[PDB]
Amino acid sequence: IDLGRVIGELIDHRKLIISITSVFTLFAILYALLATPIYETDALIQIEQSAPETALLQSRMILGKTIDDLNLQIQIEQKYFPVIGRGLARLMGEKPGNIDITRLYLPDSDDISNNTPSIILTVKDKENYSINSDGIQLNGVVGTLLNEKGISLLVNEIDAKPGDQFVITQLPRLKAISDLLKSFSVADLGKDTGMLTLTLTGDNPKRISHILDSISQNYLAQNIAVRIIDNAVTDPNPVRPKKTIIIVIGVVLGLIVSVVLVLFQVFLRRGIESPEQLEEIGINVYASIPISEWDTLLAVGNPADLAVEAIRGLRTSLHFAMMEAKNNVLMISGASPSAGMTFISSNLAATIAITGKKVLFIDADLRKGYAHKMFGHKNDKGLSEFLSGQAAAEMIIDKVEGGGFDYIGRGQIPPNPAELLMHPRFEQLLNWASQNYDLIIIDTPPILAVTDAAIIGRYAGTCLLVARFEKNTVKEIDVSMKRFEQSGVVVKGCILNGVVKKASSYYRYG
Amino acid sequence: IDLGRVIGELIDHRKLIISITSVFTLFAILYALLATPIYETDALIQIEQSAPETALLQSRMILGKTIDDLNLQIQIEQKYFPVIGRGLARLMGEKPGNIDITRLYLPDSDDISNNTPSIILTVKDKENYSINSDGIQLNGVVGTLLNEKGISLLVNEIDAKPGDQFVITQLPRLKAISDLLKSFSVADLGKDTGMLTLTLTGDNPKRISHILDSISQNYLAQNIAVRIIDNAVTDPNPVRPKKTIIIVIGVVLGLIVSVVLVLFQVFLRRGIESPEQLEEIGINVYASIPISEWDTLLAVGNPADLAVEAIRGLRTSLHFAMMEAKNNVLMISGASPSAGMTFISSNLAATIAITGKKVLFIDADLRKGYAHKMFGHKNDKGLSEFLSGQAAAEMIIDKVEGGGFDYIGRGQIPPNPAELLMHPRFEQLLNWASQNYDLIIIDTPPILAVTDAAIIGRYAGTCLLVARFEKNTVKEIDVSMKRFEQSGVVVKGCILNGVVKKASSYYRYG
Amino acid sequence: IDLGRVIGELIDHRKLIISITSVFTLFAILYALLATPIYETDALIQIEQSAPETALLQSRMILGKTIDDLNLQIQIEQKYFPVIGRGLARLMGEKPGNIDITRLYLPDSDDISNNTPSIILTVKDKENYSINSDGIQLNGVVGTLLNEKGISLLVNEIDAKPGDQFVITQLPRLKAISDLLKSFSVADLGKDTGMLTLTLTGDNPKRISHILDSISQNYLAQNIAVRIIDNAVTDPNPVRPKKTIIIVIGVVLGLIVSVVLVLFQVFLRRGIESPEQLEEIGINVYASIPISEWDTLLAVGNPADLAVEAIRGLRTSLHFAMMEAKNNVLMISGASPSAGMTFISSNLAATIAITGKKVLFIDADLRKGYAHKMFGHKNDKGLSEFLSGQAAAEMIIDKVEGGGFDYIGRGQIPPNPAELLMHPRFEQLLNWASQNYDLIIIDTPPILAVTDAAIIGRYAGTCLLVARFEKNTVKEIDVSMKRFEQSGVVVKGCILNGVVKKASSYYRYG
């Protein structure tokens, strides 16, 4: 978790980190390029206090007069069915539509919820056009006033592009004041000077300057019953969205979520990470088999594979460690199903067979052993058919043609695995084989699941646990070795398995 | 209690956590959707100080005149018998009722407690109607004034919906002023400017604007004997309830009570939680039997059950641990009643019997032993009938047909259990059985209750305590082993029992 | 990492440090000498408050009048195709071009994006000239007004130098105000005094004084409908760029990036740095061979080389350490490929051969051994052809003519290296050679890659690891020695190799 570990794991996770940071920055870029620009216009008003005037300009007396003058309760919006149609239309350089209605009158439905009745205008050409309110499309012309079904609408100088849609809202006068007041702002910048820096912000730049001029002139005429130094002009540079600030916030947010998520995943996993985690508990790791990219045995399929090199390292370390053992029986038990126990056992048997010693591979996993499904098999007369007494030692032994070693499958699943393994025929078999073979690899179920491994390991000189690299935890290995000790079985050490090529010391040589 | 433990237990308790948080958020949602909306109207008053004026507007001179003008001491409320009828009626979109009374006069009961006499109006149609005060329903019509029994009520423009009920309260003028003053508010926003931002809040939006206009105009006319810039208009967005703030508070409160309650339950329980709690005290846990979902023996009913796999693990660990013991008698004692002692003893006997050794199961719980109620029994001539000398060793031994092992029940409850067990016939029985059987499992009462276990364990080579997973505490096990030591009995170890499948290492295999 | 280490490594890295600091300071110098100078002019205005006046001077009423007077919306720039052409032109002492246009009128394209239509003027002589807008070059003369294609341009007193290019921009009046306002500044310096210290900054010094005089006089005439104490004069010393501040910032930035980068590289490397790093772990370093600057053996090519002196030191230390060893076989294994293992083994063999003892050099790296590619070879009948049984001990031994020692190459690459080395012929060979030779140096692959070294080291009395100086890490050496221990091989110590002459204690003597 230290800085060195941090940088190593971040480079290991660099794909995820850059992916999520880049996707957030892409969202930031698309938003900052599609967010409608907001322009700001400013005016300067001169008086000879000004504390009241901040509150008279923003009063519904002054603003409401501007709505009554510019007809700001008639709202016009170019229709884009997507949420980003307007932005993309601007990006393509398309001129945005605009029309002028000097007199609009909806049927005054003005319901409690839909107090803002909405109609859609369909432009057909530069002169004639139609409106769809709820289906009845009334064709009209600029100039002449259409008065049908309570629709009194007079549009003039309609825009050029045909086929466009304009949503029209006759929103209430109070709303048309409140939104203006929200977009409007006053300040003093002298704290006693007559200087008032009126600011109004909106999307339509030519419209906001007109609105602010109207506000200033209405305030002037009202105060007559004050000097407008310079009328309102719009700054051509939009003030929102702030493109630079958005993007850097996108980057910082992407990196911060990346860091929190990578630390979350680091504190998520609990499996083994290195042989030294087991060796701290006092467990001799005899090999760290790296994960092989690759039905035949890997030891005879691709003998030059790194996993087979690690298994040969295991063969030599076992050959040293298994001398002085009471007999030549080696019991390999996986710390869990899906620990790679039969992989390791079968290939270790093959690599010891090519050496030239006689190897017997007993699959004493009577519960879900499948070595017969992987070596090519005579399924009749396996191990369970022998412990049940209905077979002899010779009809159960086979020959793996590839690996070059003898093999005893489980046979049929018995209903009483543990009760079968306790039968004295099993020690008979082992005593016979240990005379007629050089090494016997017995392959047993876990010990955290059943007790079979602890029955078999009574007659085995060497017992080894197999742990998958990041699947099994240290707790499982420790509990398994303690449970083996309770039953009088000494687990010599562990075979850590399926270690990633990032963490394996093995590399291709030759 | 660490963060890892915290998250693990919260996911374990996620059902309760999400249930209570969701129910609080549901209460918050129903409240925020049923709480009557409160609208706010604002007006702006201009003067040329204003410190006194904050206190003249809110004076009973100005307000009381508005009550006298708008008849605000006549209260009208649509009747909803539930506490949430009004909210649900609004939610269904129903128009809320309202009527107008320009002249109301109750009989002026005006008692000390009920100084606000209440009557209920029953609307029958758009023109005629009736009132029930205390039973006498007087039928009346809008327009004409009904004057009966001191009821002078003139209602006009009664609402549309028939059959509704309106509770009418002629609350006192002082109350009609005090509530208005509570809902009314003034400020200055310039600290010297003539700007007064009058605000009045209420549920009826069209009514509060009228009230605030009346207040402003009364203040104007009074000050004549000041300028109203813009009259009162109501903001259509209700200011209360604050729906968003309520919901987030509901979520935060649900989570905080969830955390405090889960920590409370964590600090509530004191039972055993893991074998390592016992192993810290120096107690050898020989098995952790997981809780079986499942009258016959589980070892013969469902031999593939996980609990029977754990008992076979116990069988092998005992077989190793019981060699070198002075005799083949195993004494199993529960740390408490309801520790699963007879479950474990019976199934361990069955699993050792299927192996092929001769097992005698003695139920030396002479107080409330019920193995005979569970194996199928000849209740005559049990253990107590033998210690009393009125039976021989042969008429007391039985055969469990399922388990395949011999069995000795307690027989009849004696009046002197401990005094019976001390009789030298019991050691005679054990010395005989230990010659004619391979394993003898004696099943004894607790030691924190009686002394029988410490009498029996004098003749037992191996003694084992059985602790239920979260029922028995570590204190009970420690006190039991110390009390066994005082009596010269060595408790070899413990059998932790009924461990939950969340905490058991056993899993199904095959 | 301590101050002594810091200074030592900085002097070691002084080339990089001074290189990067000098390149940043060179960039700073070129920028500070090419950044266009910015002059500042100041004026003093006297009034009898002045808080409003700070905001009237900077108002678009006053500034816009100055643009309308001096035609500041007509922008003129001498064209330099590089980004630094203007700076270099000034540095060469060239007079900068300038022309005067009293009336300019572009075709008023004024598009949404290109609202600032740009044209380029091509001066041909002191009187006549031409303009290229988008290709159509219209020839014109100073004085007379050319009016073609909507181009109304009247330039007069055009500059001297022919062939120059002037980019002309009729930028909008609002932009011509906003840039001026950005460059303009007012202050009071008395906080109540009428003193206003107007400051205007720009590149053209004669132009900014004229602009500030125009601003002051326009403000004066406006306030008539205030006293200009001293008109605007430009300080001849440019105020930007601040040459001294830039250079010192360049130096400080260069040194700070140098420090952070050298510390980054220090915390980057993880290889061995000294023999004491290995000796801390308990590893006997027997030699530290320094890196030799130099196909024949270095021990016979340049016997006076420092690396050969270090190998003779290794020869004596080995001679002492290898007495009492079980046999005269020395196994040298590199901790990694590219550790210099065959370099060290071959030269140690040569230096022991010149002494006069019989040396056999066995190249038991059957995977990628190349001693035969370096001694001159008969490639037939190597080691692998002997273990396969298809050669005898005599046809595999050779004579290195230079080194003076016998030699056994690997031969052909076998498909089963480890399986070959396990054949009992290898111990036959060693037992024979250890009788017919004084020292046998067996050269083996790594142990972190294959298991061959641990097979060979079973029959070797002394085993030595070879670590490259900064390539191999301490972790590799420790893991290699532990993996050798697992297989029953005792690694006597290490030979640290390729140590830099900065860190080697060896020096030329004689």
Numbering used by the authors:
A (entry chain H), B (entry chain G), C (entry chain A): 17 to 64, 85 to 261, 409 to 477, 494 to 709
Verbatim from the authors:
Gram-negative species couple polymerization with translocation across the periplasm and outer membrane and the master regulator of the system is the tyrosine autokinase, Wzc. The tyrosine autokinase domain forms the cytoplasm region, while the periplasmic region contains small folded motifs and helical bundles. Autophosphorylation of the tyrosine-rich C-terminus of Wzc results in disassembly of the octamer into multiply phosphorylated monomers. We propose that the cycling between phosphorylated monomer and dephosphorylated octamer regulates glycan polymerization and translocation.
Reasoning the negatively charged Glu would mimic negatively charged pTyr (phosphotyrosine) and create a protein resembling a locked phosphorylated state, several Tyr-to-Glu mutants were constructed in WzcK540M. Analysis of cryo-EM images of WzcK540M with four Glu residues (designated WzcK540M4YE) revealed ~50% octamers, as well as other state(s). A 2.8 Å-resolution structure of the WzcK540M4YE octamer was determined using the same approach as WzcK540M. The core kinase domain is unchanged between the structures (rmsd 0.4 Å for Cα atoms 452–697) but the tyrosine-rich tail has undergone a large change that now places Y708 at the active site (compared Y717 in WzcK540M). In WzcK540M4YE, helix α23 is unwound, and the resulting loop no longer makes any contacts with helix α1, whose position is altered as a result. In WzcK540M4YE, Y706 points into the same pocket as Y715 in WzcK540M but this residue no longer makes the hydrogen bond with E675. The change in the tail results in a reduction of the buried surface area that holds the octamer together. The structure of WzcK540M4YE, chosen to mimic a phosphorylated state, showed a significant conformational change in the tyrosine tail, which would be predicted to weaken the octamer. The WzcK540M4YE structure shows that the tyrosine-rich tail would be accessible to the cognate phosphatase Wzb. There is some evidence for different oligomeric states (other than octamer) in WzcK540M4YE but none were amenable to structural determination.
